[PDB]
Amino acid sequence: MKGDTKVINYLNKLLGNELVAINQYFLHARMFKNWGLKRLNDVEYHESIDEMKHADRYIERILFLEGLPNLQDLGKLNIGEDVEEMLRSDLALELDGAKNLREAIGYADSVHDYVSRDMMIEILRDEEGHIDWLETELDLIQKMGLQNFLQAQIREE
Amino acid sequence: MKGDTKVINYLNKLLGNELVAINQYFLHARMFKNWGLKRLNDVEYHESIDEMKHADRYIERILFLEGLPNLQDLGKLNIGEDVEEMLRSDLALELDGAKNLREAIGYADSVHDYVSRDMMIEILRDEEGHIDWLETELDLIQKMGLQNFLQAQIREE
Amino acid sequence: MKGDTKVINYLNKLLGNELVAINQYFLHARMFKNWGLKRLNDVEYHESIDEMKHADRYIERILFLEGLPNLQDLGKLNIGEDVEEMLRSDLALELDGAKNLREAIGYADSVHDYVSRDMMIEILRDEEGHIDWLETELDLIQKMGLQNFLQAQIREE
Amino acid sequence: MKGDTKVINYLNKLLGNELVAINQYFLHARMFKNWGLKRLNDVEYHESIDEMKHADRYIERILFLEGLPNLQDLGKLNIGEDVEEMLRSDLALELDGAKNLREAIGYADSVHDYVSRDMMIEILRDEEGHIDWLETELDLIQKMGLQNFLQAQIREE
Amino acid sequence: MKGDTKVINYLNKLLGNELVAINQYFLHARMFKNWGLKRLNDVEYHESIDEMKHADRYIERILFLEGLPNLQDLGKLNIGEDVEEMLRSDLALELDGAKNLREAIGYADSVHDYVSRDMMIEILRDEEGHIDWLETELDLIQKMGLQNFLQAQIREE
Amino acid sequence: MKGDTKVINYLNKLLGNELVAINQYFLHARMFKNWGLKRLNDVEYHESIDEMKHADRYIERILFLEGLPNLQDLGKLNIGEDVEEMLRSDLALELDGAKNLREAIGYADSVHDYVSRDMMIEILRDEEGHIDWLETELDLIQKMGLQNFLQAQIREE
Amino acid sequence: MKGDTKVINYLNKLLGNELVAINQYFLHARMFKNWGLKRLNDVEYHESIDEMKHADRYIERILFLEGLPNLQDLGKLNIGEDVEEMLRSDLALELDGAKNLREAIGYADSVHDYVSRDMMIEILRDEEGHIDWLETELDLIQKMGLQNFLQAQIREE
């Protein structure tokens, strides 16, 4: 079914955001794992999986609308070197992606692509959940101190 | 994640509507229970629980958006003294709450808080279900008469 | 069964105490949940439910005694802004409520309303349990320090 | 263990109340059963059994306290000839029994027989439950009319 | 179905016998229980229940035959103060009751109330079973001596 | 929660009574066991355990009220040398303890410590059950003679 | 079987040690419980139970040997006011008891009471296990600091 060209453009932009996040979350997860911070590996691994699911949804939607999914161009990663930097980088990436989602959701409505919009609202709900987790962890580091926070990560849940 | 100030205000207003409904539905249920009208107790109790779940959702959303949930102010209850009066009061409260929801849902869209909107639309769907039940019960009283209607309530369904 | 007017007045005052506590405990719970302090959310949520059960018993007893339950007036909440403040506010509310329960229990005995008295003694036993938990948590914050205390809350027991 | 003479006298008076109620509830039940009012038979039969249990408790307590249970004297029954008359007679008997219970409960406290008091408070709680049911049934007859009320009794609940 | 007036009169006399026996057996059971003679409590309690079942049958039959069951008048109890006295009193009561049953069975036959007769023959068979047990226990007391007999009662079979 | 000083003093006096009973019942139990009187060992062992549960309740209540449980002072035991002496000594101890409980229950009510009172009434009910068993055994020894009584103890129940 | 008088004297001395430990461990356990230190309550409670089992063994052995178990005299308790004091007091008590056990074990051998000796060696093995636990906890307090140690006690295992 031939979709709106700019809708497809937004879907490719959002897919691009998810592709950066998949890689950034996955590497962060395995850095945490290497450091013995098992609980952080578990959560970040699951966030990477969540973003893969989102990417799959964008890819399938673009193909249905007869566009070409772009998996070639990869945006800038910001890995970081310690726990706080890594979490802040993930939060910043999530915030940027949420801005793009809001723009795309408004546009899809204006051209009556309500199914693409509905998909994007569900994804935005998921991303706000990631944002809530990241903000919460960052605040916990400040409240209990980094040493107590690290100790809390060494055994799974 | 810092939310829009007026969105937070709307959520607190809607929370306020739920807090009134929680108490009014609960007291109505136990009044029905005292009178031996078990089926009406069962339904109204469940509606009270439903509004508690709505209140929980508003409280959690407000806190996420970094606002302060208002559980201090409580609007006017209208309890009534007989079955028809009690059900009509509940209906009037639901209709006023629906008006407030429609206004909030439109505004949330305008400022692109699509997740708050999605939550409110789900709540509005629940409230229209309560409105349907209440309108139906009131019409049944008129159709079969109050005496037959009350007899129908003395065993749970 | 027509009850003693002043017993009903006491029952309404105690119901009033429970209604403040329901709201305060629930908001505290969700504030803790937002901060990622899962254990504190779990306990405070269950205390809110306990106060709801107490309120239900008061409402049913008042109706049996042919009085009018008052769910319209809500007393002053004291939310607080940090963990120690919130816990101290809950403890102060519990202590005020226990004072009211003692007065009502003494009065019910003097007018031979032994069933109302029996109900209130069970509720007072529940409240003294909440007092014990709150005092214990506050002492633990002193003994192990706030940072260690917070770390201990981030996984559900 | 030798008990207080006046407490033993109270227990025998209360036992006497239970003995009247056992017979009156049982005959009412079987009258309802004859008339095809199965649901009223079920409830009144259960109330009769409840009073048998109370009588058993009085008999055992009296013997423990080294007194002589009096099962020889039987107070006046008031059977009645129609449903409303029968239920009102049961209610009147319950209310008279409750007055005697309150007097006995106060006196047992005065002579420090706290175990006899504890037993009586539990029994009074049961009696107030019967009073609640009776009052409710009588109000239902008034609200839905006798014909509708009788129709509602012909299937066991 | 309008029964024979004299049959109804006999059924009320027999009911009257059952009512005395219900109370006498039950008090005897609990006296035995107080004394630690568990086996005697168990048997006498079950005999009390058997007489309750008999009373229920009389009440239902009288009501079917359109008569008025008399539960108001209570004949003379003879409690006794020691085991042998109590058992002999129960036996004397059973023998008096069997006399009345024989008269009533003969009369019911003469007026063709064969269903009332059938009911009473079953009840008489039950009563002869109680007579057998009582006679046997009294004989055992004489044969093994009271002290051995009491020892044999201090556990439930 | 700071309790009343004299309530705490009563709780420690009652704890003292329980500590004596725990030891006396336990030694009596093992003396019975040594003699081959298994049934008496079983009951007295269980009574010792019951008193341990009571002691635990007093200890926990005292600590909650911010007092200091006294486990250092131990009252006078009266062991006895034969079955009758031992049981009579246990009975005298129980009677002394019930007297202290009655005084403490009255006082707790007067200072409005209704939860301490409720706990003590439950314990008093337990103690009256022990009194009943002890009185019953002593009477059985008289009624069947000591030789028959001992024979009845050599097999468990 | 008539035992050696001085063996019985040692068994009573050791029983005396166990009686002090039962009370000291139990009170310590409930102090820990009051403080919210659940893991310490659990272990100290179990140590109290272990000492009760030892006391039972001494009591039964003394009775077999035809001596008189002494449960009347209670040695000095040393409760303490904080975690470290309490644990050190328990350790000191265990060390004193172990000295007495070694003396008694040597003596029992010299008079050929090998079964009493065998019992005591098993008990000494148990006590050395308690000593190992107490020493370990005390060292942990020093190594991780008291605040970390307390935090580790708040959830069971």
Author numbering:
A (entry chain E), B (entry chain A), C (entry chain B), D (entry chain D), E (entry chain C), F (entry chain F), ...: 1 to 157
Task: Recite the paper's sentences.
Ferritins are iron storage proteins that overcome the problems of toxicity and poor bioavailability of iron by catalyzing iron oxidation and mineralization through the activity of a diiron ferroxidase site. The capacity of cells to store iron in a bioavailable and safe form is a central feature of the strategy nature has evolved to overcome the dual problem of poor bioavailability of iron and the potential of the free metal to catalyze the formation of reactive radical species. Bacterioferritins (BFRs) constitute a distinct sub-family of ferritins, found only in bacteria, which contain a markedly different diiron ferroxidase site. Unlike in other ferritins, the oxidized di-Fe3+ site of Escherichia coli bacterioferritin (EcBFR) is stable and therefore does not function as a conduit for the transfer of Fe3+ into the storage cavity, but instead acts as a true catalytic cofactor that cycles its oxidation state while driving Fe2+ oxidation in the cavity.
The EcBFR ferroxidase site is flanked by two Tyr residues (Tyr25 and Tyr58) that are ∼4.0–6.5 Å away from the nearest iron, and by a Trp residue (Trp133), which is ∼9.7 Å away from site FeB. BFR also contains five other Tyr and one other Trp, which are located further from the ferroxidase site. We sought to determine whether these aromatic residues are involved in coupling electron transfer to oxidation of Fe2+. X-ray crystal structures were determined for the Y45F, Y114F, and Y149F variants. EPR studies of the EcBFR variants revealed that Tyr25 is the site of radical formation; only in Y25F was the Tyr radical not observed.
